[PDB]
Amino acid sequence: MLKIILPSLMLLPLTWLSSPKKTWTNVTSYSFLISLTSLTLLWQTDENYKNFSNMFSSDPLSTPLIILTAWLLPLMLMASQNHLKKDNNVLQKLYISMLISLQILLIMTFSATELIMFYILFEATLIPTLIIITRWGNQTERLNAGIYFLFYTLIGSIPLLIALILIQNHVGTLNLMILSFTTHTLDASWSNNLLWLACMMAFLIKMPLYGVHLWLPKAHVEAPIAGSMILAAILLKLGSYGMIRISIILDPLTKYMAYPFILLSLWGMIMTSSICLRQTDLKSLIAYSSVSHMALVIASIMIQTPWSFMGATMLMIAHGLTSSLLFCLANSNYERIHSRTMIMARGLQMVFPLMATWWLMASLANLALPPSINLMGELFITMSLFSWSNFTIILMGINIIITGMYSMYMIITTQRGKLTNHMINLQPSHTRELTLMALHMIPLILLTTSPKLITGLTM
Amino acid sequence: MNPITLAIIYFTIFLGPVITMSSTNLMLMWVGLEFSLLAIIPMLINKKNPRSTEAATKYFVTQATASMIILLAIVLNYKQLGTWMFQQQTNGLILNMTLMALSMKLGLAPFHFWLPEVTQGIPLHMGLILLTWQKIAPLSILIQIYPLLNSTIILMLAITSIFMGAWGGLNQTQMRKIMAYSSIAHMGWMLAILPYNPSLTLLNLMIYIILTAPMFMALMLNNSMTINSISLLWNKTPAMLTMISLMLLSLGGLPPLTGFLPKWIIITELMKNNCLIMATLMAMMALLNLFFYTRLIYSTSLTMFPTNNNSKMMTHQTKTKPNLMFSTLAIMSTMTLPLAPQLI
Amino acid sequence: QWQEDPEPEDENVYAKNPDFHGYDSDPVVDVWNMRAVFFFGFSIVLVFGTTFVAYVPDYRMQEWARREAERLVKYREVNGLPIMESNYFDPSKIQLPED
Amino acid sequence: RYGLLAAILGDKTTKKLHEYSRVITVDGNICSGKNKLAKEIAQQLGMKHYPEAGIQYSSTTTGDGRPLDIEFSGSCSLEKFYDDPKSNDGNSYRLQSWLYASRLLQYADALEHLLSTGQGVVLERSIYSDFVFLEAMYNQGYIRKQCVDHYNEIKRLTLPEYLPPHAVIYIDVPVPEVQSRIQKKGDPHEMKVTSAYLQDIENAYKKTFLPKMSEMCEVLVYDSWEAEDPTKVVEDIEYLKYNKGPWLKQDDWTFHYLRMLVQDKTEVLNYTTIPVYLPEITIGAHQGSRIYNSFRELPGRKYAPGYNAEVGDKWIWLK
Amino acid sequence: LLREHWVHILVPAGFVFGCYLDRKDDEKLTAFRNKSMLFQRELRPNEEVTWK
Amino acid sequence: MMNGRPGHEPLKFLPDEARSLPPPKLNDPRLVYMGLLGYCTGLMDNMLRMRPVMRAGLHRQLLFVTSFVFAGYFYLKRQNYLYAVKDHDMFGYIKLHPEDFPEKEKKTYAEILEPFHPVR
Amino acid sequence: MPSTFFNLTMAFSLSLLGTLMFRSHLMSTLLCLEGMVLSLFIMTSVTSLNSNSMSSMPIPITILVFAACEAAVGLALLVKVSNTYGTDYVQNLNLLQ
Amino acid sequence: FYVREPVNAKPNWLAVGLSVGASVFMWIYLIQTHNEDVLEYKRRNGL
Amino acid sequence: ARQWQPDIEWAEQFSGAVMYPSKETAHWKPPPWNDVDIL
């Protein structure tokens, strides 16, 4: 997998060497094709994993993501052509390159055989992200948000560093292939009960768990649209990908060491879903929607039943695409409105007829409408959770009712009701804004036709 | 300085560490340490400002008593073994003295009070020498005697330094002292692995030298001893803003950059030796060091602090360039990580 | 008070360039930055990509297994063998602990 | 370049000094006729004459030498100084701070010519004689107390390093007289100068400037009539003994370091940009960034001297 | 081909280099070339490599 | 560590014994990296000194890309030796002290009984 | 020497306790500092003499030669201090806080 | 052009020739070392 | 609307000889820029 990567690196030379006026089209047009080369990995004609080479591999779980990581770079660069079009021609070429490095790094992290290669690349992605959030962040508080995003991930990260070096000494190689075909069975000691927490905690932090998710609402609030898309679509899912590949070892402990997180997540799912119900900042509501719909995932990567896992793989890819779509349209309202407040800007369909159709489809993806991969995902996690304990439906049942309420409230108070009297007149929709959306949903429609590709390792 | 004097001093400041390293007769190692003490004091008071005399008088007393303690260890050994050099048989207290003493000259842990203060009153230039070409000498003496020193003490001085360095740095706003504090911290990691794998001490030093030397020549390019002063870097010289950003995050352990390797292999070696207690606590507060590094990042790069009109005047004039060393030592430092296996 | 610019206004790019596509202010760059984005975006990724992904053959062997079952079910049923015997790794291979 | 290497091998200032290798700064009031005198003094003794350092003494010295746009040169107007005293934006303090930076550049350029060529330098008003304008401005409502402290801090930080004026020729046409001169002159603004300002300036010269530099450097005050006759003064300058003055201890090995300072303009005014945030001085990040992107994009400025092709530089691919 | 038609060849070239670098890895990991159990066959006539 | 080994060359860079090892291919990815590492140093310098970034010092750019690379071949040549000594040393010991490194026997998975923790 | 090398050693520790606890005048430290060099010189000379190790007598003196200059530097700093503060008192040395 | 003629107006032609010439000596020694090296390696071992 | 660049007040905190000023520590004042004192 060096075509999904080397051609990517070369994007950096192109963003720099290219003309200031033509820099945007060379980069966006080329990475669209970079995504097309990424699609070749999907050609798996047998169940064996495609080990491209010693360090680089792609199995069913990584492949559905590498393609998404390559896909969003085009979109990210199309959603940030407006803001970042007021810059000095060298601030742009920095932002474009920053976005380019994220998927170079993220493509490799999702396509990495050695778990510590994951760690080095895993924690590197913070550098590009923190720059995108802090350097271009509009609000006074991004310095703070950046600190929260760096420390919560970093304090979790050093325990994983110690744990992975620890298993290398215990087993003798951090190669995901071998670690899988070798006998690593923890022994339920008090210490192992700590190892397990060391490995999972760093992944559980960037996958916002109810206890440590305050970093994500603060980060996406002041982050520029491209950073918020990256955090929701690819960055948070880095934590999920890690939990799937790391729990191959630590096989016995999670049977009983998971209860704490599972309950934290399911109760967390309800409270995070509910506070979405009365949050005035739209970007705030989407972020907590992201916490709740990701709290379902940590509760399926821990129950560990075949269906959970691919419920997880289905939902992660699906929610990634949906969340960005929501964060992308939130930005289009923010740029014309100039405020994140949900109460202002009422009645837009009256003035932006189509964006409202995109808003409606994004919300229906947000809630579980049935001919969507989003629902298949939740339906499956719901099933397994029920298997874990029939009572789980109650808590995963209060979340579904709340999820319907906030998803439609975003449509009802932003895209319906009487028009706002006279905010700065709202200029019509650009074709870029609409495509950036179409590019998010057309793939959501196509993937829903053949869900098999994003089903995970389990199935 | 009459250029002749400059030569004699500089030769001594350079013959000082070199005799230490080359000789085996400890005595000759002691005088190497003594010559470094004598040579550095003249340069320290070059401005001869009231702050400077204070700096040198502290540096000298701290250095002198430690030098006398190191000599006492050699004198005691001479009577416990006729040899003029530490051996397997050496009384444990004899070696511990040498650790404390040498940990004072290097300024590690509970003896970390002199360094921040002398780093504050000396010029940026002599600051570098006082931080990096004066650590080579004592460390050489320790690295030579590693097989014999105590694993317990070193670790305590190691952990303490890491903490003191980190905590001290958080509050400081003067750059010279932020660096002094970082050096205390890095010096700590170095002395942590000495008992186990000296060869890694020599990596955690070089990388520190290849990181700090560019960082200081950056601070002085604009001669800013204040963060507020380095924050207006964007107006005075915009290009160094990019690398100053990466070098400081490299000084802390963040993974893509070269700075991770020293911490990573030291942690790998300590876990190989089973200190998974000690290594864990060190790595954790090591993360505190990055917080103050990033706070500076914020002021200098990620956010643009307001500047002064008189600055437009300094832009007009051609900026005297930064030596080539900056580049070669900025890149070899910010990104060599892809070449780690051969470094270790 | 200190010196600094007054907040700049945001231009109605739709006032000039009434055909603004949202990519860049001068018109030709805009046209050529959508003529290449709709094309490389939709025309040869959503179309050629979906064509190729649709034609990936027997992805993860699930087109092979619906036949192998059919000949195994064909073979097992006609020869009278149990369709899915109840132990997979044969008991004979397994040396169980004798305790 | 000039460095220890050059100094080690000859290139010693002492060897290049002479009867007329001196610094003579002639200071007077708003209009003391001091330019004329300075010009002549310099000529008669064969010394370089440095024009008074204005808001633009830096763009002329740097690059094309062509007058920069006002905002590029720090947005200072002496013109606005006069028509709008005690202005809300403080153009008067910004004018004074830029003026101090300009003479700092001029004095340093003068010292570089003195130690290299060996020729002397007449600099008219100097960093040493700038405080009188600020003293009068604070005595008036022009500047507030802190503003004064900020200038004093910059003065204390940078002025001591440079060696003092050898002698400080002085003219003393009184305030009533100067007011007359200004009015006769056509400058619409200069003429709105408050008489008090003139007086306060005069006072700070006599009450402070002449006594204070008198013990450290020779002082030659002349009245209007005396100055009209430079020759007269040239005589005095020649009979000067330059006996006292910190200049006596400047051995070659000491001059070298001073030379290497003035040789580096970026340092001469290093402390002129100290991060003390008084409101008038602050450019402000958004405005400052724009002024920079715009000053740095001017032809021949986007790259170091010798490397920008716009003005016709060549050989860049091998430099 | 350098009137801005050379910046367009940068990425296309990266693909080529990648493909080359990639097929190189195949050459290295060629033990068990055909020595695997599930896929071990006698080289059919006129074939010196089962998979290249 | 590896110092104190018999025959150690007290101050030599790479003992001739390292002649036996294969020479580093000049295009070894690593040496090529050092090259790029170098080009960047050059470009960076131009930038910090405010010169046209790529079109200047085309002589220096070469000195850099060619100094770093030169350094590489001769460094890697050594680091490669050091690692090679490590095996000579390591493998030898495994034998000279065989008992301490016995070849234990691993039973087929049939014999071994690994406890089955149901997921349920 | 068995107990004659304990007096000298404790002399060095009593001199150690001295240099480490300052009080007013800096000279008293420097002076104390020197008390150690004498104790080290005496102990080195003593053992060299009863080990008949003549090859080592060079050291007892090298110790003094280096210690003398060391002290020369120390006193020049001291003179520098009571030229800047009119006293050698250490309290004055508290600007670097 | 420049009031103060840039010191870099015309190239330091020595700095070119010791910068260019030095690098071409590096290669010719480096490439020589490799082939020479390969040989010894090949013959030192059987081949 | 432009990214909030830091104003003078945000800058102010970083002045002072100690970032997080203590009870008695705050009483201190920043070191002289010239590295030379008035006493």
Ligand SMILES: CCCCCCCCCCCCCCCCCC(=O)OC[C@H](COP(=O)(O)OCCN)OC(=O)CCCCCCCCCCCCCCCCC
């Ligand atoms: C890949 C990993 C994840 C990557 C995410 C980002 C990728 C972006 C770049 C690549 C985008 C395209 C490639 C990825 C998606 C591929 C989808 C696809 O290939 O569709 C296959 C489909 C033919 O179906 P087939 O594959 O044969 O199904 C198996 C039956 N045994 O082919 C078709 O027939 C296409 C038909 C198009 C029209 C569909 C009309 C029906 C739509 C029903 C919508 C129902 C309501 C949806 C509600 C959503 C929420 C509101």
Ligand SMILES: Nc1ncnc2c1ncn2[C@@H]1O[C@H](COP(=O)(O)OP(=O)(O)O)[C@@H](O)[C@H]1O
């Ligand atoms: N620091 C200062 N502050 C305000 N005004 C100044 C300052 N320095 C010089 N000027 C003004 O510059 C003008 C020209 O100076 P001068 O040479 O005395 O006048 P002229 O050129 O007519 O002889 C004077 O009118 C004076 O007010």
